[PDB]
């Protein structure tokens, strides 16, 4: 079994001068994501919102408007720095949902113990014709 | 008179157009000395214009309401009235020459398709082979009819890709 890591709120943030591409009004009333990673030295990386930031030694904490920004930062950390990280979904009511490394290992590597949903056992051309599903509220591929 | 048209040999407006063109060129003439290079150029232009108008009157073209040659694009209507050179004879000429070019290109495609690298032979053209096939394409109609009667000109539909309807 695998347990998700807790979001340690009192985690230091990278050195940054302040951008205009950061959080907006969506964070207060819908959602804002957050990414946490461990860096082995003080070095400069690129923000998903524009500009350069310096992440510090040890834990680094960065909140972002969208999950795609968090994954862009994570993939640039993994490629240009060989640094893994954790992404969390933080609701404004207080509940925090763990996100990307959901079962510990990365999704491109098998784990034996995942849900194989949305996997049809037919070919592309074996879907139903749209006339046979007429007036149903579903596309032919989700039958 | 094939469709209410008069021959340009006897139509008055053809002669009027020729006179107007020659008079405009003479108005251009009346500014230089007699033996200058512009004078010789304008004299050559005048000679070309008069030769063109006299040739058009000679060849038997049809003029409409005014003096402009009209062409007939109906076989029979142009054959028995002697205007097959308007459309029919150039139709045969284009069909022959376009078939020559297309058959040469086709035979080049089928010649280089069965080589080691057909990809390279289409940007790097084998010039002797292209020259030989361009020469051989002058007998394109007989070759094409022979390959059509043999059935080797067209491809079976079962060996040709289609979309899944």
């Amino acid at each position: 079994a695998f347990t998700p890591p807790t979001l340690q709120s009192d985690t230091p943030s990278p050195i940054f001068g302040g951008s205009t591409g950061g959080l907006l009004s969506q964070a207060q009333v819908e959602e804002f994501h957050v990414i946490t990673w461990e860096s082995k030295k003080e070095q400069i990386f690129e923000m998903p919102t524009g500009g350069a930031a310096i992440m510090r030694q040890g834990p680094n904490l960065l909140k972002l408007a969208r999950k795609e920004q968090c994954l862009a930062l994570l993939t640039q950390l993994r490629t240009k720095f060989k640094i893994d990280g954790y992404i969390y979904r933080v609701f404004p009511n207080g509940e925090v949902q763990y996100l990307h490394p959901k079962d510990g290992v990365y999704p491109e590597k098998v784990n034996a113990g995942r849900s194989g949903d949305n996997t049809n056992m037919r070919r592309i051309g074996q879907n139903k014709e749209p006339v046979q599903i007429k007036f149903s509220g579903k596309i032919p591929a989700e039958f | 008179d094939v469709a209410g048209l008069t021959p340009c040999s006897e139509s008055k407006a053809f002669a009027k157009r020729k006179k107007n063109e020659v008079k405009a060129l003479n108005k251009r003439l009346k500014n230089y000395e007699a033996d200058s290079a512009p004078a010789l150029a304008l004299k050559a232009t005048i000679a070309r214009t008069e030769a063109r108008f006299d040739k058009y009157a000679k060849q038997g073209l049809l003029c409409g309401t005014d003096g402009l040659p009209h062409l007939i694009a109906d076989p029979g209507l142009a054959l028995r009235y002697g205007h097959a050179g308007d459309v029919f004879i150039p139709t045969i000429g284009f069909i022959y020459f376009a078939g020559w070019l297309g058959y040469a290109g086709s035979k080049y495609l089928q010649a280089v398709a069965a080589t080691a690298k057909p990809i390279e032979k289409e940007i790097i053209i084998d010039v002797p082979l292209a020259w030989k096939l361009l020469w051989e394409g002058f007998g394109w109609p007989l070759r094409a009819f022979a390959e059509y009667k043999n059935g080797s000109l067209m491809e079976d539909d079962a060996k040709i890709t289609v979309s899944p309807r």
């Binding site: 709120s9 230091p12 943030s13 050195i15 907006l24 964070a27 207060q28 804002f32 904490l61 207080g94 | -």
Partner: protein
């Protein structure tokens, strides 16, 4: 926030970390002087309801139509003035 150093996230204080701030709104009771506040709340008393503030727009549109009825002509306006001869046209028409 708990931003005593470089910590700009806190689940126990999630209000400040998200970015919800007043910017310039400040709480103060003192602003308008006496008697005039009562004067203006009496001026805008029953009108505060949605139906009556709709009825104000209704009488505004009534004024819009009253301009067309009697008001456009009071400021002259060429669309209700008289006309001066006419033109024939290209050919024999009118």
């Amino acid at each position: 926030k708990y931003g005593e150093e470089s910590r700009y996230f806190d689940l126990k204080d999630l209000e400040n970390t998200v970015g919800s701030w007043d910017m310039y709104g400040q709480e103060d009771k003192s602003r308008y002087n006496g008697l005039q506040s009562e004067f203006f709340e009496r001026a805008a008393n029953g009108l505060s309801r949605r139906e009556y503030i709709l009825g104000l727009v209704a009488i505004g549109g009534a004024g819009i139509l009253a301009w067309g009825g009697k008001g456009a002509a009071d400021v002259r306006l060429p669309t209700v003035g008289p006309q001066q001869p006419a033109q024939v046209g290209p050919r024999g028409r009118l």
